[PDB]
Amino acid sequence: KPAVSVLTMFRYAGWLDRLYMLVGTLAAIIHGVALPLMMLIFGDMTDSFASVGNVSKNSTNMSEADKRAMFAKLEEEMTTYAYYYTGIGAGVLIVAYIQVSFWCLAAGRQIHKIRQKFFHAIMNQEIGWFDVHDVGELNTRLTDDVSKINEGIGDKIGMFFQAMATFFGGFIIGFTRGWKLTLVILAISPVLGLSAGIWAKILSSFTDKELHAYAKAGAVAEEVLAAIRTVIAFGGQKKELERYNNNLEEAKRLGIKKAITANISMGAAFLLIYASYALAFWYGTSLVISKEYSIGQVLTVFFSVLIGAFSVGQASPNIEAFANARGAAYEVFKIIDNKPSIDSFSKSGHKPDNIQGNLEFKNIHFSYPSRKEVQILKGLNLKVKSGQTVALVGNSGCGKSTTVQLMQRLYDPLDGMVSIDGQDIRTINVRYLREIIGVVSQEPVLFATTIAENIRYGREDVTMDEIEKAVKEANAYDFIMKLPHQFDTLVGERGAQLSGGQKQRIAIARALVRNPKILLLDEATSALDTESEAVVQAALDKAREGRTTIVIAHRLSTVRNADVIAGFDGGVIVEQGNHDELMREKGIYFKLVMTQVPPASFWRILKLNSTEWPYFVVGIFCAIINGGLQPAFSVIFSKVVGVFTNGGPPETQRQNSNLFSLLFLILGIISFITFFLQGFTFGKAGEILTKRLRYMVFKSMLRQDVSWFDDPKNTTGALTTRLANDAAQVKGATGSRLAVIFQNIANLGTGIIISLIYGWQLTLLLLAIVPIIAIAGVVEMKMLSGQALKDKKELEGSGKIATEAIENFRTVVSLTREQKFETMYAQSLQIPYRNAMKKAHVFGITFSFTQAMMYFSYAACFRFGAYLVTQQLMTFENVLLVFSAIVFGAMAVGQVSSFAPDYAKATVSASHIIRIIEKTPEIDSYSTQGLKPNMLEGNVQFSGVVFNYPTRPSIPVLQGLSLEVKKGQTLALVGSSGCGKSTVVQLLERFYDPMAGSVFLDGKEIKQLNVQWLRAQLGIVSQEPILFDCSIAENIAYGDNSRVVSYEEIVRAAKEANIHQFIDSLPDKYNTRVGDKGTQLSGGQKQRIAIARALVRQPHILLLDEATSALDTESEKVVQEALDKAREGRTCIVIAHRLSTIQNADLIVVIQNGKVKEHGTHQQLLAQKGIYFSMVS
């Protein structure tokens, strides 16, 4: 993936933007080295407390001469340390405004010139360049890839040099003070990167196997939703639900393995982080015991190295943001640097006046550059004498339109020469050229502006008086005048749609305004019917009067009155002459003329997973433990420094600092066990909830009727997505988020409680400014997203002008209006440009005031905290403990509330799951309430049934349809397409209810008989039968659900469908997998399986719907024999398409407009000599 050099990317900066980028980079380095200085003054603050700490305790613990010398020393030293803390934050307030504003002001002034030069280069392209390049991706390149550059050269460079100054300056302070513990952290640095790097890929390794585990269940569900008409008509709802539930166990058992492994993967690196941290504090405590370092020398280099090691993680997104900006600028700068051979914006060529319009084509050859493997013109020669009209004829797309594109000079011919008045048209400039040429296309492009402006597009200075004259002359004036806002009416894409005749005359009026000396018209007389075209023809004839004209003629009447005709065949004029001459020639032309928000609440989600109590009970308890343990790690950190600040001999310091080093690993064993116990109980709760919800929705999806599945919104792809996405996004909000919140409720709970009993003064200061810092972290996300919605609304006005000019480029290049849309694109960009110089002002203030309140609160914490030490109210270890336990418990509740909006993604997924389960269908298939008699006649009767489809209830399909089928007889339904032949079969099924009328079976209302026992006595033979991925034995046995049926019952049925002999010689015979996975069966073979399935069921009624619709002549007769067999003693309804087949049917119904126009036996309907007779003939 290519990119640009870095010197070529900033070529639109200028010497003022170079000033902005360098001063902002200087402030980026100043702000980056600020935090290494913050840990330097922090370490010197601890050394001043430790030097007066051990002296005041090891000799004269409470005195007067000892009290006056150390507390007055602290009041002068901590004032100087607080002068340094405010001095950084006051300097950062000036600096952190500069580093982002100057880099976003330089990015805003560059991109604003990049957008104008990109769109100027697009209008400067060739038209053959638009043929080889896709125009849909080009209009989106002007919107997407320009935003990719502005991310790269914006504030992301000022934050990159901010991170690199903390990488170097954090390591400079880490080396120029200690240079020994720094090598210890750099030795354990590859151990921590390998621990989090070898388990992040194993976590993605079990992810792709978990997606492979569910993929067998989603393929089963997609097999049933695509076979929804076949799974309903056989009653296989409880069978396919069990196949989906037997496959749901695989994604639950592997989801347990995905839950056990992903907590061992998290817990092992969580232990190895604590192993290297406790070692880097046990090594730091063994060098202050050895009296090489102090307690402030170790704390300075331990933080500034870790801050410098963390700076490489906050700079790698800005490296990829700069590399993606260079990769996006490679295609953009390629268009700006592209200089064409046809420069549309050039003022170069000649300008001849007094053009009489002599036209000459000489030996023209031409090839389009999107298909260069053929020639369009092969020696095309022709003169147009001044003021004459020339009509071009010959078959569609033979080269006629090609001529008009060459006379526009919209391509550059290879061989030959095009001249106007003896002068090569390639030696004047294109804009003067096209000004002299009026193009009337086949279809006219009208722009979304007023009628006055669309006409004025031909020549922008024309007065409205002169406009009025042209609409008259073009014959469009009276039609425009019959409107309320006539010349101000807005035409195209937004306004009133004009007819074809009226649209073309506007183009004619536009061309009149241009008043050219040459006219080019292509397929003008073919936009609509002769009613509209005739007025246009009068107006065409007007526009031509005394102009040299080339017309691509489609209508014979247009061609006959022309002054000269050219006859084209294969690029070559085979004959040319007047009308009478060409008739005499009897060539091509002569041949022509004769031939011619959600409803789901929190209590509804909790009620689903309420069946498993004790996995939640261990889960809430372990998060309270791990939440309560989190301030306890700041306790052991406060007691390690508390040893070397209170005072003691350097032989109890070994046994005290080796006790606290083991206390990290006492908690480190507990925090590893309580993290596995937290994630196993919630992980099993997340995979129980995913399997149980997918079972209940797929049960409620199989209980619906067929009218629910005919909806365009409830397609089979959108149904398996809701079954997969919305049911897996509920385990991402129950197990993972409750473990996090109950930790932070216990973290900010106990971390306040531990800090309160270790001093009530400093907690009230920290718990007052932390919500002020946390509110400022929220308002900065609402003003950034608020300015993002304001800027993206003002940028769509400019992008609408680019969309209208790029999509209609073939029309705007013939009107010489590339400069007009470029100025409109520039004038629409002034309001986003004024908001861009203000956006850097807003980006600078919110970034400066966040870090100002981050350093002034650090100043106010230790200016108030040092006053608590000098009055003997707080130990320095207690000031450290109140500080460390609060800011880690508040970082827990502050970062998670920005991550907490996943609940809104889950409640709208829960409401989709709730509204599918709670939805009761119009026809409940699982209902046990029905008559269910023991009568096996199967008299079918439709009486006056009236029915409309629920998809489109505006078109009537069946009206007053009445017919009886007597026991054991066959009834055939026939008629024209869409008459409701198929519909009758679907109603006997009871796939839909009727609007009016009644459907009976043996005298009984089918709405009063159980749907299961209706469909059990119905054999459905579909048009194109759906075969399931399964053995031949199971697919056939599928017809008789809930029953013992074996190989014996399968084999007699397979005989009588005529497939036994093919099955018995096939490999693995009745076990052979068919479907998409298995051996592909022919069309004929597949349908007979559906027939065989109906035999096992042994119904008293047979529904046959347009079978034998294949193009296999012999197979059909094989099928038809098997079908004749199955019918002989069964009551049968066949939707008949093969007229010869319908000979042996008992009764035939001929349907017309929903009703029974006629009926009878075959012979009687023939002798009637009506509709049926017409069909069979």
UniProtKB/Swiss-Prot annotation:
SUPFAM superfamilies, per database record: ABC transporter transmembrane region (SSF90123), P-loop containing nucleoside triphosphate hydrolases (SSF52540)
Record flagged with keyword Protein transport: no
Annotated ATP 1 binding sites: 394-401
Domain spans labelled ABC transmembrane type-1: 21-324, 616-905
Annotated Gene3D superfamilies: ABC transporter type 1, transmembrane domain, P-loop containing nucleotide triphosphate hydrolases
Subcellular location: Cell membrane; Apical cell membrane; Cytoplasm
GO BP annotations listed: cellular hyperosmotic salinity response; cellular response to alkaloid; cellular response to antibiotic; cellular response to borneol; cellular response to dexamethasone stimulus; cellular response to estradiol stimulus; cellular response to external biotic stimulus; cellular response to L-glutamate
Topology with respect to the bilayer: Multi-pass membrane protein
Glycan attachment points: 54, 58, 61
GO cellular component term, pick one: cytoplasm
Cytoplasmic topological domain residue ranges: 105-153, 204-261, 320-616, 683-737, 780-839, 901-1177
Entry binding sites for ATP 2: 975-982
Segments forming domain ABC transporter: 359-595, 940-1177
Inhibition and activation profile: Translocase activity is inhibited by verapamil and is sensitive to energy depletion. C1orf115 regulates drug efflux through modulation of ABCB1 localization and activity.
Cross-referenced CDD domains: ABC_6TM_Pgp_ABCB1, ABC_MTABC3_MDL1_MDL2
Main location: membrane
Listed GO MF terms: ABC-type xenobiotic transporter activity; ATP binding; ATP hydrolysis activity; ATPase-coupled transmembrane transporter activity; ceramide floppase activity; efflux transmembrane transporter activity; floppase activity; phosphatidylcholine floppase activity
Pfam family, one: ABC_membrane
Family designation: Belongs to the ABC transporter superfamily. ABCB family. Multidrug resistance exporter (TC 3.A.1.201) subfamily.
Protein name, per record: ATP-dependent translocase ABCB1
Species assigned in the record: Mus musculus (Mouse)
